Amino acid sequence: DNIKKLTEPCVIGRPCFSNKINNRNHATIIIDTNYKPVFDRIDNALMRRIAVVRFRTHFSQPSGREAAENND
Amino acid sequence: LDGNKLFNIAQRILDTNSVLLTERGDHIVWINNSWKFNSEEPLITKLILSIRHQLPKEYSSELLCPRKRKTVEANIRDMLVDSVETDTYPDKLPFKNGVLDLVDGMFYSGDDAKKYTCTVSTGFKFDDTKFVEDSPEMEELMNIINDIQPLTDENKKNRELYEKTLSSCLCGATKGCLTFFFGETATGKSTTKRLLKSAIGDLFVETGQTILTDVLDKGPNPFIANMHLKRSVFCSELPDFACSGSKKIRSDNIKKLTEPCVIGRPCFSNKINNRNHATIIIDTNYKPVFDRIDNALMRRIAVVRFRTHGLDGKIQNNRYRFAFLYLLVKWYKKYHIPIMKLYPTPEEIPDFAFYLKIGTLLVSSSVKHIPLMTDLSKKGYILYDNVVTLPLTTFQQKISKYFNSRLFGHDIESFINRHKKFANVSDEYLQYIFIEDISSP
Amino acid sequence: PLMTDLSKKGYILYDNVVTLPLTTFQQKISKYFNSRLFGHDIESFINRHKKFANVSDEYLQYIFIEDISSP
Numbered sequence: 001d002n003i004k005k006l007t008e009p010c011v012i013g014r015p016c017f018s019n020k021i022n023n024r025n026h027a028t029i030i031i032d033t034n035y036k037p038v039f040d041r042i043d044n045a046l047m048r049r050i051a052v053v054r055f056r057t058h059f060s061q062p063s064g065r066e067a068a069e070n071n072d
Numbered sequence: 073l074d075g076n077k078l079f080n081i082a083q084r085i086l087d088t089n090s091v092l093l094t095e096r097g098d099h100i101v102w103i104n105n106s107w108k109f110n111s112e113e114p115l116i117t118k119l120i121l122s123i124r125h126q127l128p129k130e131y132s133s134e135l136l137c138p139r140k141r142k143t144v145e146a147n148i149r150d151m152l153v154d155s156v157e158t159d160t161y162p163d164k165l166p167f168k169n170g171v172l173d174l175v176d177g178m179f180y181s182g183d184d185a186k187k188y189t190c191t192v193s194t195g196f197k198f199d200d201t202k203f204v205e206d207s208p209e210m211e212e213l214m215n216i217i218n219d220i221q222p223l224t225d226e227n228k229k230n231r232e233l234y235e236k237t238l239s240s241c242l243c244g245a246t247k248g249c250l251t252f253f254f255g256e257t258a259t260g261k262s263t264t265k266r267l268l269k270s271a272i273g274d275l276f277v278e279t280g281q282t283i284l285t286d287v288l289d290k291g292p293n294p295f296i297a298n299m300h301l302k303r304s305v306f307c308s309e310l311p312d313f314a315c316s317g318s319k320k321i322r323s324d325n326i327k328k329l330t331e332p333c334v335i336g337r338p339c340f341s342n343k344i345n346n347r348n349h350a351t352i353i354i355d356t357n358y359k360p361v362f363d364r365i366d367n368a369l370m371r372r373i374a375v376v377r378f379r380t381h382g383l384d385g386k387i388q389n390n391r392y393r394f395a396f397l398y399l400l401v402k403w404y405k406k407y408h409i410p411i412m413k414l415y416p417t418p419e420e421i422p423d424f425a426f427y428l429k430i431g432t433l434l435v436s437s438s439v440k441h442i443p444l445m446t447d448l449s450k451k452g453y454i455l456y457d458n459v460v461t462l463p464l465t466t467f468q469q470k471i472s473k474y475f476n477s478r479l480f481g482h483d484i485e486s487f488i489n490r491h492k493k494f495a496n497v498s499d500e501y502l503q504y505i506f507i508e509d510i511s512s513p
Numbered sequence: 514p515l516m517t518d519l520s521k522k523g524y525i526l527y528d529n530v531v532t533l534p535l536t537t538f539q540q541k542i543s544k545y546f547n548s549r550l551f552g553h554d555i556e557s558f559i560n561r562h563k564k565f566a567n568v569s570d571e572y573l574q575y576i577f578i579e580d581i582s583s584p
Binding site: 312315316476478479 | 560562
């Protein structure tokens with residue numbers, strides 16, 4: 001539901017002490033992780049709004065520059 | 073030529089830069105050789121009345137009537153449009169009667185201190201009479217230091233770490249590393265805390281451990297506003313982690329507070345940006361229990377070990393206070409003028425040694441296993457989806473051979489959950505290969 | 514210096530720390546601390562500072578005062 005709501009131009013949210021319900025989103029959302037995300041519901045509308053990139057490059061130190069050099 | 077006289081008076085007052093406007097929407101004034109700011113007090117009118125004397129005598133008579141003072145205040149408020157940043161000199165320490173520069177050791181007062189906009193102070197007037205390089209005071213301190221912590225070669229590194237941390241505490245910039253005091257009771261921790269408090273005046277503050285485990289975004293939090301523009305925040309008498317049901321000190325919280333600007337809304341204040349220049353010091357008598365251990369978490373952890381087990385009256389009388397400040401500034405000169413740097417102590421907390429030895433003993437996946445898979449299949453290793461995998465039973469027995477599973481069962485389970493890769497629903501493996509398994513010891 | 518007697522009663526110096534088995538420790542507290550009065554509090558004491566030396570050496574680093582005296 002969070003991903004679904006965060007993609008529409010109008011975001012529904014009620015702050016305290018205010019009756020405002022509409023917000024305009026002008027920002028790109030970027031989320032960083034080391035593990036595959038887990039979602040409650042799987043549907044076409046969900047993964048028709050998901051794009052990822054692959055960070056397949058590791059920078060290290062000479063202490064471990066040999067063990068991690070030959071890593072898939 | 074002679075237009076609005078009150079406007080001329082307002083311009084004359086303003087050109088002396090005796091009143092400033094901050095980005096926080098509040099006005100600050102310069103009275104009694106001190107920068108004071110307040111929202112509910114008539115500071116501007118007081119400044120006008122005080123400055124009346126130095127103006128030419130044809131304006132002083134007009135300045136007496138309060139209505140004219142209100143008019144001049146309105147003009148001043150109207151002609152101020154640009155804001156100026158505050159507390160931009162971390163290398164100087166303001167006192168109740170002036171500002172002391174840490175480099176040359178001499179303290180300014182009066183108009184000289186007005187150059188730097190410092191809104192806080194130690195709370196006690198600085199005196200060079202008590203600050204003397206040649207006295208009995210520092211040799212009196214010298215025996216005290218050895219009484220609390222000697223300079224032995226075994227504790228040489230701990231002592232130099234103590235000196236460097238104490239010097240760094242005087243710096244006015246944001247610090248990314250906190251200090252931990254773990255040791256036996258009645259070892260001088262209270263004495264050192266009182267000495268530091270007397271040294272830094274009002275810059276010291278004490279807060280409980282609730283924020284370490286509570287949500288900082290819920291409800292009003294005047295505490296978060298408390299350590300703003302502070303120099304030392306003390307969390308003492310930590311709860312026994314051994315006690316069942318005790319809330320674990322969340323690592324995400326301490327990751328949040330170590331950042332230069334913590335996001336938060338103070339009560340009756342729209343000040344999103346808060347400056348955290350204070351040194352976090354946490355004193356406990358029991359080894360903490362942690363759940364998640366990570367590199368970035370452990371780069372910022374610094375711990376001072378205290379294994380060593382008339383003074384109170386002199387400290388209460390601040391007899392040793394000025395010599396303590398002299399020692400602190402000498403240490404800051406020896407260490408921090410040459411370079412502004414802070415270094416961690418990444419040896420171990422009583423609960424990080426397991427993680428460190430796990431990281432050292434275990435190696436990441438490498439192609440060197442590929443030529444040996446024929447031998448590896450003899451030891452239980454299997455190739456699933458072109459991935460080297462180890463049976464759960466084999467990993468469990470390998471772990472239990474060296475390290476007890478019943479001890480670190482919570483820790484082992486947490487590590488598995490953090491690093492679980494699913495070759496099967498029941499067989500969860502790790503991206504670690506035992507070095508001794510394939511390489512002779 | 515008391516380590517030998519500590520092993521005699523049960524406080525084994527595993528991992529450079531005394532390790533008295535919880536069986537002996539609970540027998541001691543039961544013979545001294547009356548069980549019926551504060552059994553729940555005794556269990557809280559046991560489970561608060563609980564430690565295990567190994568699979569079968571669960572221990573607490575507390576030495577009762579007649580044992581701290583050298584025999």
